[PDB]
Amino acid sequence: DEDTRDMLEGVMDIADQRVRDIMIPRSQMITLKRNQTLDECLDVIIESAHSRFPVISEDKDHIEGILMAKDLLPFMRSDAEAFSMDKVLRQAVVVPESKRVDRMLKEFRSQRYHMAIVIDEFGGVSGLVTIEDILELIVGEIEDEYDEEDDIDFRQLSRHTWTVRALASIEDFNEAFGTHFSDEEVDTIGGLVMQAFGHLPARGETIDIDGYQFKVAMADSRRIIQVHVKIP
Amino acid sequence: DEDTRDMLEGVMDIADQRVRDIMIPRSQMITLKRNQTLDECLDVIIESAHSRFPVISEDKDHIEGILMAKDLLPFMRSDAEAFSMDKVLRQAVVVPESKRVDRMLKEFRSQRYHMAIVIDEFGGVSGLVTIEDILELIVGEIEDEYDEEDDIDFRQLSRHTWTVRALASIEDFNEAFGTHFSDEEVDTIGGLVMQAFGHLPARGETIDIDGYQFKVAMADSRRIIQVHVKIP
Numbered sequence: 213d214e215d216t217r218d219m220l221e222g223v224m225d226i227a228d229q230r231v232r233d234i235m236i237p238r239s240q241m242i243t244l245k246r247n248q249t250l251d252e253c254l255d256v257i258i259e260s261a262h263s264r265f266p267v268i269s270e271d272k273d274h275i276e277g278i279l280m281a282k283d284l285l286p287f288m289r290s291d292a293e294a295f296s297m298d299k300v301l302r303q304a305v306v307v308p309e310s311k312r313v314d315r316m317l318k319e320f321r322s323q324r325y326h327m328a329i330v331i332d333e334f335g336g337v338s339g340l341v342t343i344e345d346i347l348e349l350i351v352g353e354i355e356d357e358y359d360e361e362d363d364i365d366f367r368q369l370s371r372h373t374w375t376v377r378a379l380a381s382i383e384d385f386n387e388a389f390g391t392h393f394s395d396e397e398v399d400t401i402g403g404l405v406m407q408a409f410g411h412l413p414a415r416g417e418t419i420d421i422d423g424y425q426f427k428v429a430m431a432d433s434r435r436i437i438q439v440h441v442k443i444p
Numbered sequence: 445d446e447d448t449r450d451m452l453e454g455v456m457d458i459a460d461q462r463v464r465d466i467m468i469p470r471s472q473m474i475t476l477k478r479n480q481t482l483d484e485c486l487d488v489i490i491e492s493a494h495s496r497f498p499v500i501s502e503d504k505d506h507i508e509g510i511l512m513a514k515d516l517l518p519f520m521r522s523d524a525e526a527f528s529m530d531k532v533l534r535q536a537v538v539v540p541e542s543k544r545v546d547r548m549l550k551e552f553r554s555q556r557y558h559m560a561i562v563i564d565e566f567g568g569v570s571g572l573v574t575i576e577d578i579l580e581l582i583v584g585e586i587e588d589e590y591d592e593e594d595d596i597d598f599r600q601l602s603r604h605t606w607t608v609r610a611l612a613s614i615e616d617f618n619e620a621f622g623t624h625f626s627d628e629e630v631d632t633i634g635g636l637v638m639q640a641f642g643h644l645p646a647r648g649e650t651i652d653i654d655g656y657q658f659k660v661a662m663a664d665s666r667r668i669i670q671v672h673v674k675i676p
């Protein structure tokens with residue numbers, strides 16, 4: 213089967229891949245500062261709906277440790293005290309960008325924890341990395357099957373990856389992802405893609421349009437059906 | 445490499461496996477009841493340190509939905525109201541035990557949610573199942589490497605699986621896991637195992653002692669080094 217093949221291959225990546233291949237870049241990092249009121253911290257956590265957040269020093273200097281949202285539950289009882297960024301400040305692990313993904317997985321599983329901090333040679337933070345970013349390597353081409361079709365063109369699938377119906381219009385796609393794609397020649401996403409290709413692709417084929425990775429998720433002998441796109 | 449081989453094989457399972465192979469049985473299920481004070485619910489959640497919990501009807505009858513611990517964060521602000529088992533009661537998905545693991549993974553990933561409810565033919569709950577129970581199939585033989593050795597004999601690795609040093613004594617092992625294993629002939633865990641075998645096993649070999657699954661995680665040409673055990 214294909215979806216097996218995908219995973220199988222995804223396994224082979226883990227060797228070849230380094231940590232600098234899966235990290236959330238520092239820009240994209242949703243974090244906190246040791247000097248933030250308990251009240252406001254919850255907003256960040258809620259809008260983002262994560263589980264672990266890096267804590268910036270105070271002057272964007274260093275970054276102290278990591279806060280797990282679940283630790284905030286103690287502070288919620290009756291005979292419960294006031295929160296303070298101290299009991300729940302787990303210090304945090306740092307790793308080179310050069311670190312091998314396989315190795316990361318081992319340590320992840322063995323020390324039992326989910327997020328680390330990636331740094332460059334020069335001691336700057338490049339970003340962060342997590343266990344799920346690893347499993348996505350194997351499990352990321354994996355999704356359900358759709359027949360008639362669903363009003364939902366676009367679906368988030370992993371961090372940077374959406375599974376979009378090919379029949380979705382360039383109009384509707386551009387709105388959603390805020391993209392600047394063009395029609396006239398073609399009106400739907402599958403036509404855009406098929407045009408970039410210049411032939412009718414088969415599943416797995418990939419093509420770069422304007423820094424966006426498009427991969428033929430699903431296609432027959434007449435037409436592209438589903439395509440995954442990776443936001444840059 | 446071996447740890448690749450493991451994963452690769454773990455992928456092959458996903459086809460052959462059904463949902464009734466990975467579920468947490470109803471006994472082992474950490475849950476809640478719609479009629480539990482906000483205060484006490486936190487205790488359950490904290491001791492267990494989970495993320496999603498099934499809510500029992502009120503008379504152990506049906507089970508209503510699932511509560512995600514993160515939803516409890518809204519109720520923690522200043523201008524925040526009183527919690528009520530209603531806004532945070534997501535209804536919950538149910539599946540046959542017969543369900544194919546691959547299929548489950550697809551739906552898991554596509555609808556984006558992590559836990560489901562397994563039922564038998566007759567409409568009884570058999571247990572629950574989650575996305576991580578799936579990824580463990582591929583990623584569960586995966587751990588770090590140890591040289592000298594660490595005072596830590598035993599380590600949790602996944603739900604039912606500990607990675608124990610072979611040099612660990614039957615004495616110390618029995619205490620920990622509450623087991624009734626015997627010495628005289630042999631004093632360490634690797635000897636117990638090697639004795640059950642009757643030869644020096646190679647990595648991957650498995651042997652059932654008293655309902656406990658032992659698998660040679662790590663062994664050379666002289667001795668068993670690490671072994672994983674699956675609590676029944």
Ligand SMILES: Nc1ncnc2c1ncn2[C@@H]1O[C@H](COP(=O)(O)O)[C@@H](O)[C@H]1O
Nearest residue numbers: 241242261262263264265266342344345
């Ligand atoms: N504090 C954070 N900052 C940036 N990205 C995050 C953060 N926490 C989680 N993520 C990302 O969101 C994914 C799911 O984690 P979570 O949302 O915490 O369940 C991870 O694989 C990361 O890619």
Ligand SMILES: Nc1ncnc2c1ncn2[C@@H]1O[C@H](COP(=O)(O)O)[C@@H](O)[C@H]1O
Nearest residue numbers: 473474493494495496497498574576577
């Ligand atoms: N409410 C629950 N009852 C029983 N087992 C659970 C529950 N929540 C999570 N688990 C188990 O714990 C693992 C990790 O989930 P969590 O502890 O929620 O991060 C899952 O793979 C399940 O096997």
